[PDB]
Design a protein that fits this description.
Distance between the termini of chain A: 36 Å
CATH architecture of the largest domain in chain A: Sandwich
Helix content of chain A: under 10%
Structural class of chain A: mainly beta
CATH topology of the largest domain in chain A: Immunoglobulin-like
Radius of gyration of chain A: 19 Å
Oligomer: homotrimer
Keywords (chains A, B, C): Metal-binding, Oxidoreductase
Order of helices and strands of chain A: EEEEEEEEEHEEEEEEEEEEEHE
GO molecular function (chains A, B, C): copper ion binding; oxidoreductase activity
Largest sheet of chain A: 5 strands, mixed
Protein name (chains A, B, C): Copper oxidase
PDB class: oxidoreductase
Number of strands of chain A: 21
CATH superfamily of the largest domain in chain A: Cupredoxins -  blue copper proteins
Strand content of chain A: 35-45%
Bound molecules: copper (II) ion, hydroxide ion
Organism (chains A, B, C): Streptomyces coelicolor (strain ATCC BAA-471 / A3(2) / M145)
Chain lengths: 278, 278, 278
Amino acid sequence: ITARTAPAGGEVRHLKMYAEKLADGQMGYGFEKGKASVPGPLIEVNEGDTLHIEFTNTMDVRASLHVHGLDYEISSDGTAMNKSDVEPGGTRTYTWRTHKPGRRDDGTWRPGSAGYWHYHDHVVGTEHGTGGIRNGLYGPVIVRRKGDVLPDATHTIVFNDMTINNRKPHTGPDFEATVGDRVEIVMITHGEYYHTFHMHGHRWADNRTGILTGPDDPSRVIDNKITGPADSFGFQIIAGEGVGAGAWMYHCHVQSHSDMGLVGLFLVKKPDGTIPGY
Amino acid sequence: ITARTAPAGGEVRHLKMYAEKLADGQMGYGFEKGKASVPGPLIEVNEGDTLHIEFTNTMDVRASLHVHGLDYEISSDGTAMNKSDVEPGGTRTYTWRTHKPGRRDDGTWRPGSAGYWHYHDHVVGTEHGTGGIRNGLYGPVIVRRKGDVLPDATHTIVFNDMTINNRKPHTGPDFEATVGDRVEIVMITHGEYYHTFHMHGHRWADNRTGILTGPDDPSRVIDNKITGPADSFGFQIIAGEGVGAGAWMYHCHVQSHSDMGLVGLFLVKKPDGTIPGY
Amino acid sequence: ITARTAPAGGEVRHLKMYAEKLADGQMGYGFEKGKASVPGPLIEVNEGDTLHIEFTNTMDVRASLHVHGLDYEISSDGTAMNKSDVEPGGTRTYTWRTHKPGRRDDGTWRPGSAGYWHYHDHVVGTEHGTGGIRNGLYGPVIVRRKGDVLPDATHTIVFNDMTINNRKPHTGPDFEATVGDRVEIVMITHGEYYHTFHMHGHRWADNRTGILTGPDDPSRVIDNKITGPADSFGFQIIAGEGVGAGAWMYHCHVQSHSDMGLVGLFLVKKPDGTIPGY
Ligand SMILES: [Cu+2]
Ligand SMILES: [Cu+2]
Ligand SMILES: [Cu+2]
Ligand SMILES: [Cu+2]
Ligand SMILES: [Cu+2]
Ligand SMILES: [Cu+2]
Ligand SMILES: [Cu+2]
Ligand SMILES: [Cu+2]
Ligand SMILES: [Cu+2]
Ligand SMILES: [Cu+2]
Ligand SMILES: [Cu+2]
Ligand SMILES: [Cu+2]
Ligand SMILES: [O-]
Ligand SMILES: [O-]
Ligand SMILES: [O-]
């Protein structure tokens, strides 16, 4: 492999995070006060890393941080039941741990933490974060395994109820790339409804990484994946591989969803920066 | 492997089953008159076993037994069309067969019967058992392959429309375990609606067993799975592995579903029987 | 393997297709004027083949051809945005390409085009073909990999909203086979709703081909699969394997869907042409 690959993990990382009410009434996570985003900032670690997150809730209501897939003690559950939420103006240190796969004492295989995961609130609105998730308190988490292929760029697409990344319908978001770029997509679904994520002119493997192991990987190759609330998957593609440059549509394939504007553009540019037709 | 493993099948097993109307208007299967349950009793066999079920319908309406995955002749279809239902007060002997995987005469690979399956009624209410399934006429079936890891306990979680195991919302059910227990979950969905099964602090493999074959198994590791009517899957987890004891929530992640009480507790106790915080 | 297997691809194939308004108001694809069908004709190629489709839109509204999975340039996108639709009475030549899997220059594995895909309209009614898909402008595409097992017959089952193959509910369609036949099913879903495809007495692998690679294939074996709009999968079964002849039901397992008539019959006949009971 002549491409960049993820190293071995084991580092102890520290992070500061805030929950902010936005001017339009939404709620977002951020690494800096005044720089929150919906979806929240991407967190990327390696198998074996430990992450300490000093989380500060700047809003006037209780908020929390809850993560999927990664190892965390009950004190970092992010739920009101386990007293793991954060009071208004408060600060709490969450700890997320990751581990590598390996054989157990009984001989069974313990799975690793690697995967395309996500984090979100769990106490805003209801005891399951229905209000916080609706307001935009969600973000992606990537846990890499040693040797995983590293992309050129990563984009996060969240189907939150009837929006993409809490945006107004018919407003994208759109992304750009050049023919040959290794583009990574993190695909998260939240809210009430099922969806189907579809991409024109591109396909991926329905497995952990979206890439086939090799000639023996039996995982199916798809361009349409059904998703429900709290589903998260990801993949890597070569922009324009075997199809060339163009304005390549991605959208939900539930007919009324795409009709109502749950559509975006994957703009794959020629080496001279042009998109065929435009 | 120093853990208990499933032996080779081939035994001819006999079983007696009843369909009972319950005092509250529900309908349940049972191995003994007056001891019906919703969900019905678990049936567990090994690949190659044959199961003869003497089924007695004690109710005042026609009922039947229909199974997924296992081998059965058209006489054991459990449908009115094939005259395989049971009249009120009647008794009928169903036969379920299982087989091991192997190579066919043409060289192709024939799949085995192993998996996490389920049984349910097919004639109460409608010709597809809509009334019987709603009333609680469903239960799990496990078919083990030789060498499959055996658990310490098995729990069945059924998303039947807007209930868990036909229970009133906000009433669980809850389960208990100790840190280190090998807990098996059988997850069945019935009715009208899609769902997403989610577990806090625990994850499994999205394959036949929920366990990874080894370092080569490309199956994805998840903690959130979308399900539809008649879907059935299962997995095994080590209670508290890498996360410790605590009141670990399992729930549907469709936001209104968890808000309306489709939540339960996986109580993982410390060696001294305590749950952190309680 | 003593069964028929797919050869190596690489041929350049030519095809003529029409879009026709039908007398009942539906819309169908066809290889001949006056011989359109819903679902449209099956297109079957091998990995490496190139397909040139001379498509003629005979209807009074704009129509197009859009394919999943296969390689196509932006000029064959089939969308109004990319000026790839066809005017009333017009003719346009689409090009679909396929490729074999292989190792990239960076050492990564490029997936092949093989799979169970489908084609449909993208501009009738809305800019996503909501009207054309509803009217019946959809059909299956099979891309075979060298060595793939060839079936005795292929049947296409499309869950288009609340219909099977745009048929009136309670009208099938039904299929026939003989015990031992190698039957292939192409299963496509379109429209607004999720479904679950279920088959009595038969099961398949949830992978690319529906067949297990061998003793090492970890893919799950199922008889119930959830599907959403634009999902496409397929499989092969031996008719009556381990279960014998009979009228074997296939249906959606969403309870109201089967109750409303989204049911069909897989009639597996004895060597003398009889179905047990009839
Ligand atoms: Cu939760
Ligand atoms: Cu959608
Ligand atoms: Cu498409
Ligand atoms: Cu969650
Ligand atoms: Cu049925
Ligand atoms: Cu639910
Ligand atoms: Cu969670
Ligand atoms: Cu069923
Ligand atoms: Cu499209
Ligand atoms: Cu359906
Ligand atoms: Cu069935
Ligand atoms: Cu499409
Ligand atoms: O959650
Ligand atoms: O069924
Ligand atoms: O599409």
